[PDB]
Amino acid sequence: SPPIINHFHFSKDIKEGERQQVICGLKSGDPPFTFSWLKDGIDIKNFPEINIVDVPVSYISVLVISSVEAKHIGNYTCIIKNSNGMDSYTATLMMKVPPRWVKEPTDVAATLGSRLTIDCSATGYPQPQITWDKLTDRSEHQLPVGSDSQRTLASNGSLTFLRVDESDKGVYICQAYNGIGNGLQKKIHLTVHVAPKVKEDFTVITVRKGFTAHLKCEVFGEPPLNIIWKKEDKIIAFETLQENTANGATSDTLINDSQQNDSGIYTCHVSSQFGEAEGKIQLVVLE
Amino acid sequence: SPPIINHFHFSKDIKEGERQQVICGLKSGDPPFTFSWLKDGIDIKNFPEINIVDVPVSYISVLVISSVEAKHIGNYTCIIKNSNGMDSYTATLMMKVPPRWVKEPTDVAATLGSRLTIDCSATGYPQPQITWDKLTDRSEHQLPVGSDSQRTLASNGSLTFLRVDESDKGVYICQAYNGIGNGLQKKIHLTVHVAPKVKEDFTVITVRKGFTAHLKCEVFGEPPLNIIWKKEDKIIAFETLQENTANGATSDTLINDSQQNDSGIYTCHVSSQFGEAEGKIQLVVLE
């Protein structure tokens, strides 16, 4: 009689680490038998991390997978053949992974005119889809952002602004979904901020020799602002005062007793998280 | 005197699970002091999974991150202010993850004329780029596949064929790279196979009543082929012979002693891993 096969199945909620064994046994049929395994039409000898245990004395053969990586997903077929015919049965290895964050987005503070790039990554099986929705406080409604002119969404869901504008403020949301679970969703607040600017590009300070020369450098910006003075690309150690204000700060620094080798140009450099600026103040000591 | 800050730094080869602490302490400066923390221009009160330990008696404040998820990457700034000025210092939290396979590709056996979709996924930081190169055995050289007409590479590196052709045989390679390490590379063998076809769509078998009616159904295909006969969508249990060949198999089945309620149409259905076909054989019993 031809062989008939006992239906077999893989576990239900399979996870990457787990092992899996499926037994191909007989209902009926006269020996001798020959067992044979396939995965999606390819023979199982190919995949060596899969090895099959066969005990033909007991009329069975077992497929084993010691650790199920998602490549194992697919259809596995066992074929039993004798000198009267063959039976076969296929079982499906199924696996689902809901999204987990790779790169969560967070609240962002962007520089106007800069080229911002927010990242938002996630992983799972299938590979999750990353979508951005901005919240319009005209009625707190979601509207998908998308790759406009002056905007971009790269291969991996990274939202990139070409020139940041006051238009691009408020709260945004990226959403990772692959069909498993509800997915992920992250709401972030974008705020726009202005790069610092020295009020005056370059001012002349002229004095007679040997006086308390008084330098000046107020700058516009958002606190904090950290100002460093220089001469010919060397730091000034001399006495320096740095009083703050609201729209920035002013730096009043003075050099006591002037010299003709000190006469030249100086550099008021300011640094911040939103940019950096430089004013070059020049000094000449007349007789 | 204005406060001056002791430079601090995050660990060098940071990994997701680890904790990170950075101490903002003073070199010099006269009290009282006020400590303040920022991340990329945003204040640290926002991120609550970050909490700061501050002990102003010892002139220090510590930022702590109990488990560094990649969102923590960026620049952290500590600001110390007194009634003479402020100092500040920023340190960068850096993290790299080389690619690991999410969905490894494997050897594939495609049906001609079908719409194949090979998957190839990977994960890491930054999110890896997935590229396909086919090996031309004209000189075993790589050539990037790309989204042709009759081909496609989806968002996540899934290579999709619209109509599979003999053109699309041989070994291919997908390569995952994000800049860290050398990345990953996987070489797979594509082989093309033909869906089974019943030789004859529908044949008339006519006999007189009460004879050993002899049915016939050879089919073309690649082994294995599993044939099931039916009548009005019910299985035939009756005597059936299924002898194989090279290009497929033939199924010679016979019904002993005919009846007028048996007279009708029958269905030779074949199933395989590369497709399924049906021939409808018809029977009429004349007097």
Residue numbers in the entry:
A (entry chain A), B (entry chain A): 0 to 236, 243 to 292
What does the original paper state about this entry?
Recently, a shortened Dscam (sDscam) gene family with tandemly arrayed 5′ cassettes in Chelicerata species has been identified, which encodes ∼50–100 isoforms. Crystal structures and cell aggregation assays demonstrated that both α and β subfamilies of sDscam used Ig1 for the isoform-specific trans recognition in a hand-in-hand manner. Furthermore, the cis interactions were established by the three FNIII domains of sDscam, which assemble into a cross fold with a kink between FNIII2 and FNIII3.
We also determined the crystal structures of sDscam Ig1 from another chelicerate species Limulus polyphemus (isoforms α7 and β3v7) to provide insights into the conservation of sDscam trans recognition within Chelicerata. These crystal structures of Ig fragments were determined at 1.3–3.1 Å resolutions. Similarly, sDscam Ig1 also employs the ABED face to form an antiparallel homodimer. The trans interactions of Chelicerata sDscam were mediated exclusively through the Ig1 domain for both sDscamα and sDscamβ subfamilies. For both α and β subfamilies, wild type sDscams lead to cell aggregation, while truncation of Ig1 domain, but not other Ig domains, completely abolished cell aggregation.
